[PDB]
Amino acid sequence: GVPIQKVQDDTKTLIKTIVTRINDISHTQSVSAKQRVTGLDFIPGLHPILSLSKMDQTLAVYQQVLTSLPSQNVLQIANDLENLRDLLHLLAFSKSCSLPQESLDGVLEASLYSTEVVALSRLQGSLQDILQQLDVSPEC
Amino acid sequence: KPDPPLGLHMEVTDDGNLKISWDSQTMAPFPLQYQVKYLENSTIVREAAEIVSATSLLVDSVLPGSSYEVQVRSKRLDGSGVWSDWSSPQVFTTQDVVYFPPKILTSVGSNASFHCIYKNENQIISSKQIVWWRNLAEKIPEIQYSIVSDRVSKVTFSNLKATRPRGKFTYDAVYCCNEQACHHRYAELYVIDVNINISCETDGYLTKMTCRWSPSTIQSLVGSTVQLRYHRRSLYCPDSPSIHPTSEPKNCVLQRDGFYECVFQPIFLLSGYTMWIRINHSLGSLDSPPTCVLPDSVVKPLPPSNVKAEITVNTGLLKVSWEKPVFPENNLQFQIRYGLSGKEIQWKTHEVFDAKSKSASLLVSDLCAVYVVQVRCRRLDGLGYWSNWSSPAYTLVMDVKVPMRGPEFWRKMDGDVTKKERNVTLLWKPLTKNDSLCSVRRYVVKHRTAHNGTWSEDVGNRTNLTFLWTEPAHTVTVLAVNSLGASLVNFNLTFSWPMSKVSAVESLSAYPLSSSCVILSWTLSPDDYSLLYLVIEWKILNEDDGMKWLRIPSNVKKFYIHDNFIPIEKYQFSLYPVFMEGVGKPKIINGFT
């Protein structure tokens, strides 16, 4: 009933689309993704996201973070993240496996620009990693 | 003690069911049981009383032409309650003639059954006396007639056809009659086309969704409510277009284009919208086939931006360059239209199938005129729209390459024969776009003498140049210099008196083919000097002006001259043979035209 190949292609196209659309926001491309910044360790940045449950909890945290930033572009990107999380639930249903389901304000208030630019470049990295491992037999 | 019940109401259903309702006492914190008494003032007066725990009661088989009166009282269900006072009675009266059902709304291929209890002079005639007529025009065949009972007449339509609208009558109005005695009562059978094509477009920023749709067929029924109903299912659309039970209405407004257009904003992008047009008609609700869409699949393809159309130097192609729009992200087909600039344009079209190609080269008949080019793009799979044609792109007039063949030039003599220093007016013509390619920037006449060697003087854009020839021999080569260089193939013409007396033509004659055409015949002598070509010089005889020359190959014997010939004037045909060393003596004849 549900064609899985269409879902993989739509997943790839939406990921590539969100990364390029966010890629049009010029000030983030010149910011080093791998440079470590003390204080934003709660943001699930590059730290092996090697399981379906880790991807799900990562996108859940990212959703919770994006929900508090008042930009419209990020709100739709968050909507795409919602479609993506529901899609990852559908993919786990395809492979058969169950999926279960604060300090942000302080850094948002004291340093919003740094927090946003890093959070966004880390989001781009998370999507690039999931993509780079969405073919090496992803497992729940 | 509880208060008396209030809000008494009564209604009659289609089949003949008597529904009695009353408002429950919410102020009472206890359940209430209601004693309801009804007095049926029918042809025989009856009275009854019942006790019901609920707030509704049913009395089946409503008698035609009969009155009904209802009164209600209430009492506490639990405990030693006290019966409340009786409420206000309600009285109602019924009607005679019956249809089952009054009307039917359906589509093609249905099995519509109709019945009528037909009253003739207060008597229900037999079902064999009831005859059904389609719009009082053609009797319905009795094969479709059926006998539910003697007093109920039945007609049936299996595998219905589309009830084609007759004027404002989209339905069929069946009349059941006492044979030739027809009442005014009729039953309406509707078949309505609902197939509407909806075009939806997602904005160029991925924030809002805009849908347009044309109610082309539905502009035939009025008084009913026509609206779009959408339901958002979490992911994508169901593989079978279906109606989810829960749905919401969408506010949409008609615009001057004839399409209802409305916007969802902000958007839930892969979150499927199943919409369809519901039409609350008097008979029910006609529903268009539920069409579900994923908005991401109907994004607008923007007209491609920053297209430059120019001329490729040294190749003569039409180069077009562009960039992909912001959206979409799938592969794209591209269409290009191009033509010569002007009020009228002959549009040539080409298509590109690979999205990686951001540049293209094209062939065009004209190489050096202003060109207008416009671009559009669509999704390669076509699941979308064709973009608006881009803004016009104008090429710049630049030379493709150096010219190929040089201009043909000849000499005009001014001065006395004994006066050696004579004015030679070199006269040529501008090259064609095949020789000059795009244009000739300037003309350079390079001279050659045994004294001054080889030297050149720049002429400008003029095709005439008068220079004082003094030496016994003087060579001239005219070069057409474009923005890149001079013409490749060029002709050299030498002027020299001593061998200007050299003969090369034996016989020459002319014949007036017409006032516009003349044939020139000549036989040549064996040439000792290398005869490159000839120059026919024709002018009005016994005059100075009217001087016109044409170059002729030396390898031919026949020629045709076309001009506005003047038949009164004899014309001096002066065929000048041209050699490698210089110009030979002309063969001069005189002949009418």
Add this chain to the structure above:
Amino acid sequence: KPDPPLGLHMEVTDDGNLKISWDSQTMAPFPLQYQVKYLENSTIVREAAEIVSATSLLVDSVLPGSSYEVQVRSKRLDGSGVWSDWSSPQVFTTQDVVYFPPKILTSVGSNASFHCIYKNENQIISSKQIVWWRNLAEKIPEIQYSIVSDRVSKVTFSNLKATRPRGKFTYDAVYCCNEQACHHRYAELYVIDVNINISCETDGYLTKMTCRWSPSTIQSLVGSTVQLRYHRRSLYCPDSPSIHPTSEPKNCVLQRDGFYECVFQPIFLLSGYTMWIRINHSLGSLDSPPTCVLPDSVVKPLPPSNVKAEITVNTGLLKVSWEKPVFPENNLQFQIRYGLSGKEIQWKTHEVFDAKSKSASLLVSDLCAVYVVQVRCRRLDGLGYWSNWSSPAYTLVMDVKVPMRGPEFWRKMDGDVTKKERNVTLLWKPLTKNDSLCSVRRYVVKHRTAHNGTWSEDVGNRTNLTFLWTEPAHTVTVLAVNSLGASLVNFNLTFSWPMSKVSAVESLSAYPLSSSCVILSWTLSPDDYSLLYLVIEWKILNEDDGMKWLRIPSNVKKFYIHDNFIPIEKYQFSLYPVFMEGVGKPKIINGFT
């Protein structure tokens, strides 16, 4: 007993200190002494209570990543007072990085420096190891470093080039780090294009200053007021434009083009205006480079006025007269564009280099054709602009001289051949603007006879005149009299029977080039009499009317006859030679057309 202190406040300074300020007891009519205890829970815990007579206190050299608990109590300063209770303690928590200062808001070309305190594991690292980065791009050069202290590191920026934008940010981001590991907080460098060129112009009436400036850059940081500031120096602009301490604001209004314009009236024509833009922001204030303007130097030149164009008498030159514009009074060169009057004007330019010349003269081809002429003026030194084109000058259609040439006329014979006195009907044709100037009042036929002498008869504007020729010899001349006089050149044609038999044409031939083109040749006999010209008379063969004539010069053997000939009717062509002594004998042929 004093009220305990309220409104405790404390802030980290730009120079890495802490200032504590709190609200005093307003209701107390007596001075107050304040004991303020700070608990610095830094890398080293330090609880210390200080005493202040005022409400301000400072703590220096803050330790990064530290808590601070601030408590205040108050007491009556004079008398046997009692110390009041503590105020509310307040807690600050510092971070890993301290900036000196956090941010700078300034203009292009300034000198801006920072200092850094970087914590790492509660160890203030050496200034030799503190290194900065601008928005995480590249390492600041070492020459721009400095060591105020081993912990307070320093960076310096000289010759600040304006920060070209990187996204919607309006600053450079800065982190100072222990090389490879550092903190979240970001330092802002606000530098924008402050060098602005506000264009100010004087109105043509010298009563208005209008200044426009485009704020394309400022509309990126919000919350800052913007205004125009200016000062007026008494006379002229000093070579160094600078802000005098007295400054005044000017109200200005935005327009549709996004420019702010400022409107000033009345104007001090010689007072120098030193002008700039003030931007008052929360961080601080910025001022555009002061520029001084002197109004007379920005005056748009006024068009020349009172322009009348007329054709000069007896010469045909185009004389244009105008009055100099009121301002400026300096010498001006005049560019005069001129051409025909119509939709398209072939504009040609005349250059006048003396201001005193309020009128000039030029050359034209037609001497009564309406023209469009305009004049503009520029300052002689070129300091200024080009004035608007003067009022379009138009020339009147009027004759300037006597006519140059009289009309061409020919004779028609009425009467029998034998009888002496025949009716000569002279037919001429109206004269165009080439010989008749532009109008003719009348035609005068001056006779010349051996018996009646010479007499002139006025025929008005008629092109025909029938007169009885009686004498053996009769010369006739036609003069075109305009409003100013008679035509200069006037053909004289003599009538004489003895010379009416004098033949001057050997042969005459005609060929039908087309229906409207009849081509005619003739060979003439050796003429003894003084022959002026010939007259071609063509008419349909054997008719009374259809009679038509043209004047051919006798020097040619060609004539194109362009007329609505009837193909089916053969035309009789008569060539009449014209002599001083009389009309010669014609040659008559017949030919198709």
